[PDB]
Amino acid sequence: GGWLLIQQRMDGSLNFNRTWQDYKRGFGSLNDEGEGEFWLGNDYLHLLTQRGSVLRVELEDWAGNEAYAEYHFRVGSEAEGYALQVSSYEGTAGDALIEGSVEEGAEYTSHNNMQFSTFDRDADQWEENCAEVYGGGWWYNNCQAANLNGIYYPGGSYDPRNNSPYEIENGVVWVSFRGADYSLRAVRMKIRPLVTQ
Amino acid sequence: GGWLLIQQRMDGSLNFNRTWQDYKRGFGSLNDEGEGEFWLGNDYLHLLTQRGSVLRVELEDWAGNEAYAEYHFRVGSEAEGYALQVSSYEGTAGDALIEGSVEEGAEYTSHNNMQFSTFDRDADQWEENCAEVYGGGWWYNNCQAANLNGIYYPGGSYDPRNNSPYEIENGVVWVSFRGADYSLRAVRMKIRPLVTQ
Amino acid sequence: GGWLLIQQRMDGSLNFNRTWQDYKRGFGSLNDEGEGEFWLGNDYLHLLTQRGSVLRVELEDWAGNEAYAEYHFRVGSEAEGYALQVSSYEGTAGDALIEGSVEEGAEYTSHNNMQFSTFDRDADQWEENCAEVYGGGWWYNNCQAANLNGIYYPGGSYDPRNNSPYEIENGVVWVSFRGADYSLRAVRMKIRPLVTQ
Amino acid sequence: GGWLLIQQRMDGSLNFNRTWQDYKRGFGSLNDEGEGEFWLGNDYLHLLTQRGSVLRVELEDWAGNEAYAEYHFRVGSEAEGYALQVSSYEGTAGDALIEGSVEEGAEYTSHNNMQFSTFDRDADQWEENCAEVYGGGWWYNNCQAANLNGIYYPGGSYDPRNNSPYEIENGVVWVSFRGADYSLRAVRMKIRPLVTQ
Numbered sequence: 111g112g113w114l115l116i117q118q119r120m121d122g123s124l125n126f127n128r129t130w131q132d133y134k135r136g137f138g139s140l141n142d143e144g145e146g147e148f149w150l151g152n153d154y155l156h157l158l159t160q161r162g163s164v165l166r167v168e169l170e171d172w173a174g175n176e177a178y179a180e181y182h183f184r185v186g187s188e189a190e191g192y193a194l195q196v197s198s199y200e201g202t203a204g205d206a207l208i209e210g211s212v213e214e215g216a217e218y219t220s221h222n223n224m225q226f227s228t229f230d231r232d233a234d235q236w237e238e239n240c241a242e243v244y245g246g247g248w249w250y251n252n253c254q255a256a257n258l259n260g261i262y263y264p265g266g267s268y269d270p271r272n273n274s275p276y277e278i279e280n281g282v283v284w285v286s287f288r289g290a291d292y293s294l295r296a297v298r299m300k301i302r303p304l305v306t307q
Numbered sequence: 308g309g310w311l312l313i314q315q316r317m318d319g320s321l322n323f324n325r326t327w328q329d330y331k332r333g334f335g336s337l338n339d340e341g342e343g344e345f346w347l348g349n350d351y352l353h354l355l356t357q358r359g360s361v362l363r364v365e366l367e368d369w370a371g372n373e374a375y376a377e378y379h380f381r382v383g384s385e386a387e388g389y390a391l392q393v394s395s396y397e398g399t400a401g402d403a404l405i406e407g408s409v410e411e412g413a414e415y416t417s418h419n420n421m422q423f424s425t426f427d428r429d430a431d432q433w434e435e436n437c438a439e440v441y442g443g444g445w446w447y448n449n450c451q452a453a454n455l456n457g458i459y460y461p462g463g464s465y466d467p468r469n470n471s472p473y474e475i476e477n478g479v480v481w482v483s484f485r486g487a488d489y490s491l492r493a494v495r496m497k498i499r500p501l502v503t504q
Numbered sequence: 505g506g507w508l509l510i511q512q513r514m515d516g517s518l519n520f521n522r523t524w525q526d527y528k529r530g531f532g533s534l535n536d537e538g539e540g541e542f543w544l545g546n547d548y549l550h551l552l553t554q555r556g557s558v559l560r561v562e563l564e565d566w567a568g569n570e571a572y573a574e575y576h577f578r579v580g581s582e583a584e585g586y587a588l589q590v591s592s593y594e595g596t597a598g599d600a601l602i603e604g605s606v607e608e609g610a611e612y613t614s615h616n617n618m619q620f621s622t623f624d625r626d627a628d629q630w631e632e633n634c635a636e637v638y639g640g641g642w643w644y645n646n647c648q649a650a651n652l653n654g655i656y657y658p659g660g661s662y663d664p665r666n667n668s669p670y671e672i673e674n675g676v677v678w679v680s681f682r683g684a685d686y687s688l689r690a691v692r693m694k695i696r697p698l699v700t701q
Numbered sequence: 702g703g704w705l706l707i708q709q710r711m712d713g714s715l716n717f718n719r720t721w722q723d724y725k726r727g728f729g730s731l732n733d734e735g736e737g738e739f740w741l742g743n744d745y746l747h748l749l750t751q752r753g754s755v756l757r758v759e760l761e762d763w764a765g766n767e768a769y770a771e772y773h774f775r776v777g778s779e780a781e782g783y784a785l786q787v788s789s790y791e792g793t794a795g796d797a798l799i800e801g802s803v804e805e806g807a808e809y810t811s812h813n814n815m816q817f818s819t820f821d822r823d824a825d826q827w828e829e830n831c832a833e834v835y836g837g838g839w840w841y842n843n844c845q846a847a848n849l850n851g852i853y854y855p856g857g858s859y860d861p862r863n864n865s866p867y868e869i870e871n872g873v874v875w876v877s878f879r880g881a882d883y884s885l886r887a888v889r890m891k892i893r894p895l896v897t898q
């Protein structure tokens with residue numbers, strides 16, 4: 111396989127609500143088997159995408175149904191805020207990154223061309239701080255249609271009115287697959303850097 | 308108008324790998340603050356559930372998440388193997404007693420209409436002994452989607468490969484809430500007279 | 505606040521490795537302040553407990569920690585081997601008399617319903633002689649989780665590898681409080697009729 | 702297996718509430734069989750860790766469960782307050798050193814990059830004295846998620862209400878494995894210095 115892993119969630123044991131510097135360097139780790147929760151690190155991700163790449167997102171719900179989304183993908187440098195560039199969607203999970211959510215349209219929930227934010231480095235399009243409330247570092251707009259770095263709620267369906275400190279859909283979510291009130295069981299991001307050509 | 312406690316786990320201080328006699332009579336104790344581990348006794352459950360009842364199950368993981376399930380409940384007599392009869396699920400934990408584990412399939416993992424089995428009194432649907440392997444007395448099929456009388460593994464996530472003497476998923480489990488290789492921190496079962504609600 | 509003392513250990517001055525006759529009659533003495541080593545006598549225990557009683561057990565280790573356990577207690581007649589009947593545990597020492605050792609299981613280490621055995625009158629559940637080897641008269645099963653009449657080792661922790669003639673865990677022990685290889689510094693047993701307090 | 706032992710507890714007989722000077726030189730003793738309670742000494746720890754090392758933590762609770770944690774580890778010099786630097790968690794006990802306590806908050810209970818403190822030498826991040834209250838010398842933040850040098854409470858489960866002088870969770874603890882209110886039975890820390898390749 112020419113793919114390499116850049117992110118994975120599988121049991122909620124790792125905290126994803128971290129600082130700019132943790133997202134920049136990478137945290138967590140994977141094993142021999144390739145099991146474990148982690149984030150590769152925005153600085154190495156910038157470097158790995160220099161010559162272009164294909165991103166593959168794999169999702170799994172609490173009943174074992176699966177879906178995937180593939181995109182052409184680039185991550186900008188730290189001066190560009192690690193901005194996201196994606197195009198050419200293909201898959202079964204639905205295009206949450208370019209089109210955002212059907213309920214509230216692209217304008218506010220599209221992720222394409224957004225910078226990365228964290229709770230201590232806000233570069234989103236909201237008057238408030240998305241990352242603080244949604245719980246992870248991500249490419250926020252105002253604020254999201256998808257967030258694989260959100261809070262791990264076990265079981266699937268969750269009632270946001272039951273969350274604290276914020277009564278919001280801050281779970282591990284991909285709207286066009288299971289909706290904003292459904293937190294996913296296992297998720298991973300993998301890229302194929304187009305190193306030759 | 309209130310509930311009666313019929314089982315509780317919270318620290319693994321009590322061994323639940325017990326005989327048919329221990330499960331018929333009851334073992335364990337609660338202190339006046341309601342703490343401790345126990346099993347009320349199948350003879351007593353048959354008695355209290357004779358006109359029908361509502362069962363409530365309350366589950367807690369090692370990160371503070373909680374969920375519950377409610378059913379209409381009745382246990383059969385001794386000569387009927389204290390067989391379980393449940394219906395009318397409602398809740399947040401997911402229905403592991405009637406639909407069982409969608410992934411493994413209801414034919415093998417549903418608990419409804421199953422007799423109770425212990426290691427010295429096997430009436431499950433497996434050619435082998437479920438209670439022996441899974442570690443406690445329960446309403447086994449072949450073998451389980453849930454088991455609140457399983458082995459208390461401290462800390463939550465466990466790897467069956469490390470278990471001895473059987474390398475299997477025999478923790479305190481409720482598959483539709485936390486999966487099969489996560490053992491819960493605190494669990495309790497409570498009932499109420501059908502009339503009194 | 506009147507309890508009658510029935511047993512006490514505190515300085516190892518008294519031999520507890522004695523015959524059926526001596527355990528039936530009683531041996532040892534107390535001073536004016538309630539100090540000294542002693543065993544009241546099983547014939548008196550049957551008599552005083554005929555209508556039920558509350559038993560209180562007090563334990564003290566060599567670092568100053570203390571724990572207690574309370575039970576409803578009865579002893580049978582001589583022809584019944586002065587068998588132990590206990591229920592309704594309450595306390596902080598853990599229930600070593602009814603539930604036994606969490607690790608070894610209730611089947612072999614439970615003391616409830618056992619006969620009292622001495623080296624000259626073995627009625628335990630072992631093919632060998634528990635009382636010979638564990639050093640005192642007790643309500644042995646196969647053989648124990650608790651024994652307040654075992655060997656008084658100095659200082660707490662001991663190594664059975666170092667014991668003669670039997671390399672075994674035969675100290676003054678209460679497994680759920682301090683384990684099997686820690687012998688306790690002071691212990692006592694006391695009773696009172698249910699009515700009072 | 703090129704491991705050195707650097708700490709070990711097994712029955713609570715050695716007092717761990719000591720001075721900066723005792724922690725710097727080392728205290729306690731081990732017999733030939735590698736048995737005994739002791740602390741190697743921060744000055745010698747700094748020397749053995751100059752080229753990096755692997756730290757192995759081994760834990761045992763009062764019902765026979767065991768867990769371990771491995772980290773890359775280094776301890777700074779005395780001028781740097783013997784600061785802790787760990788990375789690369791793997792294991793089964795959960796990462797209490799880098800993630801801190803999920804419930805109380807990582808910010809306050811994470812141990813990475815903290816300095817060593819003792820009751821007579823406070824460099825913790827609290828306005829009060831962590832070492833004085835929690836009972837031992839340790840790499841305190843405000844104050845802890847783990848502390849193998851805490852007060853030894855017999856039996857496992859303890860009630861903070863019953864502690865004195867202070868009513869807190871100051872037992873021998875590793876929160877992601879057994880929680881803050883359960884004191885462990887046997888614990889050890891061992892290193893493998895990377896003398897290298």
Ligand SMILES: *[C@@H]1O[C@H](CO)[C@@H](O[C@@H]2O[C@H](CO)[C@@H](O[C@@H]3O[C@H](CO[C@H]4O[C@H](CO)[C@@H](O)[C@H](O)[C@@H]4O[C@@H]4O[C@H](CO)[C@@H](O)[C@H](O)[C@H]4NC(C)=O)[C@@H](O)[C@H](O[C@@H]4O[C@H](CO)[C@@H](O)[C@H](O)[C@@H]4O)[C@@H]3O)[C@H](O)[C@H]2NC(C)=O)[C@H](O)[C@H]1NC(C)=O
Pocket residue numbers: 718820832833834835836852865866871
């Ligand atoms: C680990 O090991 C360390 C080091 O040994 C321990 O740290 C010490 O813990 C002590 C426990 O909290 C801590 O507190 C001291 O308490 C003293 C009080 O003791 C009695 O007497 C004083 C006054 O006498 C009183 O205030 C206390 O309440 C208590 O009882 C009082 O006693 C007086 C005596 O007549 C009575 O009049 C009062 O009525 C009575 N009151 C009550 C409510 O009972 C303090 O005196 C002591 O202060 C010290 O003494 C002077 C006070 O200014 C000063 O010269 C000293 O520098 C210092 O202030 C203190 O408050 C000790 O201070 C801790 N010592 C150190 C070096 O840190 C840990 O407890 C151990 N950890 C664990 C987990 O076990």
Ligand SMILES: *[C@@H]1O[C@H](CO)[C@@H](O[C@@H]2O[C@H](CO)[C@@H](O[C@@H]3O[C@H](CO[C@H]4O[C@H](CO)[C@@H](O)[C@H](O)[C@@H]4O[C@@H]4O[C@H](CO)[C@@H](O)[C@H](O)[C@H]4NC(C)=O)[C@@H](O)[C@H](O[C@H]4O[C@H](CO)[C@@H](O)[C@H](O)[C@@H]4O)[C@@H]3O)[C@H](O)[C@H]2NC(C)=O)[C@H](O)[C@H]1NC(C)=O
Pocket residue numbers: 521623624635636637638639669670674
């Ligand atoms: C609580 O009190 C109980 C009652 O006192 C104690 O129980 C008693 O426990 C002892 C120890 O096991 C038993 O001892 C009996 O006496 C002899 C003990 O064995 C020694 O002696 C024989 C032969 O003499 C020998 O083969 C053994 O090897 C051993 O020592 C040997 O001694 C010889 C010299 O004789 C020497 O040359 C050898 O080198 C040496 N061996 C070694 C390795 O050094 C046995 O002979 C006894 O066997 C039977 O014989 C007698 C009856 O005819 C009688 O002694 C025994 O009852 C037995 O039938 C036996 O070993 C006692 O049997 C036992 N008594 C009872 C009533 O149970 C108990 O120990 C104590 N508990 C605690 C914790 O302190």
Ligand SMILES: *[C@@H]1O[C@H](CO)[C@@H](O[C@@H]2O[C@H](CO)[C@@H](O[C@H]3O[C@H](CO[C@H]4O[C@H](CO)[C@@H](O)[C@H](O)[C@@H]4O[C@@H]4O[C@H](CO)[C@@H](O)[C@H](O)[C@H]4NC(C)=O)[C@@H](O)[C@H](O[C@@H]4O[C@H](CO)[C@@H](O)[C@H](O)[C@@H]4O)[C@@H]3O)[C@H](O)[C@H]2NC(C)=O)[C@H](O)[C@H]1NC(C)=O
Pocket residue numbers: 127229230241242243244245261275276280
């Ligand atoms: C991902 O992690 C981040 C990094 O940790 C977490 O973000 C952090 O989130 C906290 C919590 O929301 C931010 O602090 C907030 O709380 C304080 C106080 O909270 C409580 O008190 C205040 C009033 O004191 C209330 O506004 C809150 O609702 C809470 O309830 C109150 O509690 C009081 C006790 O303090 C009590 O007396 C009062 O009655 C009670 N009221 C109610 C209704 O319960 C807020 O004060 C704080 O606002 C701050 O104001 C300061 C100046 O006033 C500023 O300096 C602070 O920066 C901030 O503006 C804020 O609402 C914390 O700021 C934030 N940290 C960062 C770096 O962003 C994040 O939550 C995690 N997300 C998930 C999903 O986990």
Ligand SMILES: [Ca+2]
Pocket residue numbers: 232233234235236237238239240
């Ligand atoms: Ca903003």
Ligand SMILES: [Ca+2]
Pocket residue numbers: 429430431432433434435436437
């Ligand atoms: Ca079978």
Ligand SMILES: [Ca+2]
Pocket residue numbers: 626627628629630631632633634
């Ligand atoms: Ca026998």
Ligand SMILES: [Ca+2]
Pocket residue numbers: 823824825826827828829830831
């Ligand atoms: Ca301080």
